[PDB]
RNA sequence: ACUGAAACUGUAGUAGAACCAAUCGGGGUCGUCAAUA
């Protein structure tokens, strides 16, 4: 956007494609696999619990003053929980 | 169903102005000393 580039907080799988070509392209036709769907390289997301971190579900809601996942409390799964009495 | 490329946080700017390390002072001159028996 003009003279600034904003950055993602994950690595998209397309950036690893050139590495997939370089390392494995001699063992199979990588381009053919891509076209056929025989290859998936996922996004690289932050490692949590020793595994790929999973994008925070939008069905989670924080108590606006005192809650949310950053505050570690007052997090409601609105797929399963009614909105509390008097708390936005 | 495929990483954009390429681009010097540089350019100009005197840590300086002001402030006496100074003020006063004849290299001079006279009475004892000591405490017992």
PDB file of C-alpha atoms (C1' of nucleotides) in Angstrom:
ATOM      1  CA  UNK A   1       0.000   0.000   0.000  1.00  0.00           C
ATOM      2  CA  UNK A   2       2.072   2.848  -1.336  1.00  0.00           C
ATOM      3  CA  UNK A   3       5.444   2.886   0.407  1.00  0.00           C
ATOM      4  CA  UNK A   4       4.560   0.315   3.103  1.00  0.00           C
ATOM      5  CA  UNK A   5       4.255  -3.477   2.998  1.00  0.00           C
ATOM      6  CA  UNK A   6       2.293  -5.152   5.783  1.00  0.00           C
ATOM      7  CA  UNK A   7       3.304  -8.675   6.758  1.00  0.00           C
ATOM      8  CA  UNK A   8       1.381 -11.835   7.535  1.00  0.00           C
ATOM      9  CA  UNK A   9       1.763 -13.627  10.863  1.00  0.00           C
ATOM     10  CA  UNK A  10       2.207 -16.977   9.095  1.00  0.00           C
ATOM     11  CA  UNK A  11       4.155 -18.305   6.116  1.00  0.00           C
ATOM     12  CA  UNK A  12       1.906 -19.261   3.181  1.00  0.00           C
ATOM     13  CA  UNK A  13       2.550 -22.635   1.600  1.00  0.00           C
ATOM     14  CA  UNK A  14       3.409 -21.077  -1.775  1.00  0.00           C
ATOM     15  CA  UNK A  15       6.720 -19.741  -0.419  1.00  0.00           C
ATOM     16  CA  UNK A  16       7.928 -23.298   0.232  1.00  0.00           C
ATOM     17  CA  UNK A  17       7.106 -24.419  -3.326  1.00  0.00           C
ATOM     18  CA  UNK A  18      10.518 -23.399  -4.654  1.00  0.00           C
ATOM     19  CA  UNK A  19      12.129 -25.418  -1.874  1.00  0.00           C
ATOM     20  CA  UNK A  20       9.876 -28.375  -2.805  1.00  0.00           C
ATOM     21  CA  UNK A  21      11.047 -28.075  -6.423  1.00  0.00           C
ATOM     22  CA  UNK A  22      14.696 -27.698  -5.468  1.00  0.00           C
ATOM     23  CA  UNK A  23      14.816 -30.578  -2.992  1.00  0.00           C
ATOM     24  CA  UNK A  24      12.379 -33.095  -4.473  1.00  0.00           C
ATOM     25  CA  UNK A  25      11.904 -32.070  -8.101  1.00  0.00           C
ATOM     26  CA  UNK A  26      14.371 -34.736  -9.215  1.00  0.00           C
ATOM     27  CA  UNK A  27      12.415 -37.543  -7.532  1.00  0.00           C
ATOM     28  CA  UNK A  28       9.026 -36.844  -9.110  1.00  0.00           C
ATOM     29  CA  UNK A  29       7.449 -34.296 -11.419  1.00  0.00           C
ATOM     30  CA  UNK A  30       6.546 -31.696  -8.790  1.00  0.00           C
ATOM     31  CA  UNK A  31       4.654 -29.523 -11.269  1.00  0.00           C
ATOM     32  CA  UNK A  32       2.479 -32.460 -12.303  1.00  0.00           C
ATOM     33  CA  UNK A  33       1.709 -33.254  -8.663  1.00  0.00           C
ATOM     34  CA  UNK A  34       0.697 -29.623  -8.065  1.00  0.00           C
ATOM     35  CA  UNK A  35      -1.589 -29.691 -11.109  1.00  0.00           C
ATOM     36  CA  UNK A  36      -3.155 -33.020 -10.060  1.00  0.00           C
ATOM     37  CA  UNK A  37      -3.378 -32.142  -6.369  1.00  0.00           C
ATOM     38  CA  UNK A  38      -0.874 -34.827  -5.304  1.00  0.00           C
ATOM     39  CA  UNK A  39       1.013 -32.243  -3.263  1.00  0.00           C
ATOM     40  CA  UNK A  40      -0.056 -30.091  -0.343  1.00  0.00           C
ATOM     41  CA  UNK A  41       2.254 -27.773   1.518  1.00  0.00           C
ATOM     42  CA  UNK A  42       0.317 -26.118   4.331  1.00  0.00           C
ATOM     43  CA  UNK A  43       0.827 -22.654   5.746  1.00  0.00           C
ATOM     44  CA  UNK A  44       3.528 -22.502   8.387  1.00  0.00           C
ATOM     45  CA  UNK A  45       1.820 -21.281  11.554  1.00  0.00           C
ATOM     46  CA  UNK A  46       3.387 -20.545  14.916  1.00  0.00           C
ATOM     47  CA  UNK A  47       4.332 -23.652  16.863  1.00  0.00           C
ATOM     48  CA  UNK A  48       2.173 -24.115  19.977  1.00  0.00           C
ATOM     49  CA  UNK A  49       2.353 -27.162  22.267  1.00  0.00           C
ATOM     50  CA  UNK A  50       4.919 -28.552  19.839  1.00  0.00           C
ATOM     51  CA  UNK A  51       2.431 -28.468  16.969  1.00  0.00           C
ATOM     52  CA  UNK A  52       1.210 -25.982  14.387  1.00  0.00           C
ATOM     53  CA  UNK A  53      -0.811 -23.220  15.999  1.00  0.00           C
ATOM     54  CA  UNK A  54      -4.396 -23.026  14.821  1.00  0.00           C
ATOM     55  CA  UNK A  55      -6.062 -19.758  13.901  1.00  0.00           C
ATOM     56  CA  UNK A  56      -8.208 -18.500  16.775  1.00  0.00           C
ATOM     57  CA  UNK A  57     -11.868 -19.449  16.195  1.00  0.00           C
ATOM     58  CA  UNK A  58     -14.116 -16.461  15.533  1.00  0.00           C
ATOM     59  CA  UNK A  59     -16.808 -18.205  17.615  1.00  0.00           C
ATOM     60  CA  UNK A  60     -14.805 -17.323  20.729  1.00  0.00           C
ATOM     61  CA  UNK A  61     -15.783 -14.116  22.516  1.00  0.00           C
ATOM     62  CA  UNK A  62     -14.170 -12.208  25.352  1.00  0.00           C
ATOM     63  CA  UNK A  63     -15.785 -10.179  28.075  1.00  0.00           C
ATOM     64  CA  UNK A  64     -15.149  -6.717  26.725  1.00  0.00           C
ATOM     65  CA  UNK A  65     -13.745  -5.135  29.903  1.00  0.00           C
ATOM     66  CA  UNK A  66     -12.091  -7.996  31.765  1.00  0.00           C
ATOM     67  CA  UNK A  67     -11.950 -11.050  29.490  1.00  0.00           C
ATOM     68  CA  UNK A  68     -10.729 -12.586  26.250  1.00  0.00           C
ATOM     69  CA  UNK A  69      -7.937 -15.029  25.473  1.00  0.00           C
ATOM     70  CA  UNK A  70      -5.339 -12.339  26.103  1.00  0.00           C
ATOM     71  CA  UNK A  71      -6.700 -11.888  29.615  1.00  0.00           C
ATOM     72  CA  UNK A  72      -7.064 -15.657  29.996  1.00  0.00           C
ATOM     73  CA  UNK A  73     -10.598 -15.462  31.365  1.00  0.00           C
ATOM     74  CA  UNK A  74     -14.171 -14.740  30.374  1.00  0.00           C
ATOM     75  CA  UNK A  75     -13.913 -16.491  27.002  1.00  0.00           C
ATOM     76  CA  UNK A  76     -17.237 -17.750  25.680  1.00  0.00           C
ATOM     77  CA  UNK A  77     -17.773 -20.168  22.815  1.00  0.00           C
ATOM     78  CA  UNK A  78     -20.888 -18.567  21.374  1.00  0.00           C
ATOM     79  CA  UNK A  79     -21.584 -21.764  19.432  1.00  0.00           C
ATOM     80  CA  UNK A  80     -22.334 -23.350  22.808  1.00  0.00           C
ATOM     81  CA  UNK A  81     -22.807 -20.572  25.395  1.00  0.00           C
ATOM     82  CA  UNK A  82     -25.491 -17.927  25.724  1.00  0.00           C
ATOM     83  CA  UNK A  83     -24.294 -14.354  26.005  1.00  0.00           C
ATOM     84  CA  UNK A  84     -24.009 -13.638  29.755  1.00  0.00           C
ATOM     85  CA  UNK A  85     -26.423 -11.461  31.694  1.00  0.00           C
ATOM     86  CA  UNK A  86     -25.461  -7.798  31.504  1.00  0.00           C
ATOM     87  CA  UNK A  87     -21.970  -8.426  30.087  1.00  0.00           C
ATOM     88  CA  UNK A  88     -21.145  -7.310  26.552  1.00  0.00           C
TER      89      UNK A  88
ATOM     90  C1'   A B   1      -1.904 -24.110  -9.923  1.00  0.00           C
ATOM     91  C1'   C B   2       4.166 -21.788  -7.966  1.00  0.00           C
ATOM     92  C1'   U B   3       8.373 -16.561  -3.001  1.00  0.00           C
ATOM     93  C1'   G B   4       7.834 -10.279  -7.367  1.00  0.00           C
ATOM     94  C1'   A B   5      11.779  -7.407  -8.824  1.00  0.00           C
ATOM     95  C1'   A B   6      14.619  -3.266  -7.513  1.00  0.00           C
ATOM     96  C1'   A B   7      15.356   1.053  -3.473  1.00  0.00           C
ATOM     97  C1'   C B   8      21.896   3.531   1.663  1.00  0.00           C
ATOM     98  C1'   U B   9      17.047   6.420   6.929  1.00  0.00           C
ATOM     99  C1'   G B  10      19.691   9.499   4.638  1.00  0.00           C
ATOM    100  C1'   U B  11      20.469  15.019   3.754  1.00  0.00           C
ATOM    101  C1'   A B  12      22.060  20.330   6.485  1.00  0.00           C
ATOM    102  C1'   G B  13      23.560  21.882  11.608  1.00  0.00           C
ATOM    103  C1'   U B  14      31.180  23.919  15.406  1.00  0.00           C
ATOM    104  C1'   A B  15      28.692  21.524  22.587  1.00  0.00           C
ATOM    105  C1'   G B  16      28.956  26.599  22.483  1.00  0.00           C
ATOM    106  C1'   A B  17      28.492  32.054  24.636  1.00  0.00           C
ATOM    107  C1'   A B  18      29.929  34.601  29.021  1.00  0.00           C
ATOM    108  C1'   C B  19      33.341  34.724  33.642  1.00  0.00           C
ATOM    109  C1'   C B  20      40.833  38.123  35.573  1.00  0.00           C
ATOM    110  C1'   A B  21      41.977  32.205  40.121  1.00  0.00           C
ATOM    111  C1'   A B  22      41.497  36.210  42.587  1.00  0.00           C
ATOM    112  C1'   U B  23      41.247  39.385  47.486  1.00  0.00           C
ATOM    113  C1'   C B  24      44.235  40.891  52.551  1.00  0.00           C
ATOM    114  C1'   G B  25      49.411  40.238  54.717  1.00  0.00           C
ATOM    115  C1'   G B  26      56.946  44.930  55.629  1.00  0.00           C
ATOM    116  C1'   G B  27      60.676  38.246  56.220  1.00  0.00           C
ATOM    117  C1'   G B  28      59.746  40.637  60.819  1.00  0.00           C
ATOM    118  C1'   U B  29      61.568  41.331  66.039  1.00  0.00           C
ATOM    119  C1'   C B  30      63.868  42.054  73.393  1.00  0.00           C
ATOM    120  C1'   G B  31      62.992  40.730  78.291  1.00  0.00           C
ATOM    121  C1'   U B  32      64.188  37.044  81.482  1.00  0.00           C
ATOM    122  C1'   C B  33      63.685  31.980  82.781  1.00  0.00           C
ATOM    123  C1'   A B  34      62.819  28.357  86.873  1.00  0.00           C
ATOM    124  C1'   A B  35      60.170  26.993  92.327  1.00  0.00           C
ATOM    125  C1'   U B  36      61.264  25.986  96.266  1.00  0.00           C
ATOM    126  C1'   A B  37      62.905  25.846 101.677  1.00  0.00           C
TER     127        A B  37
END
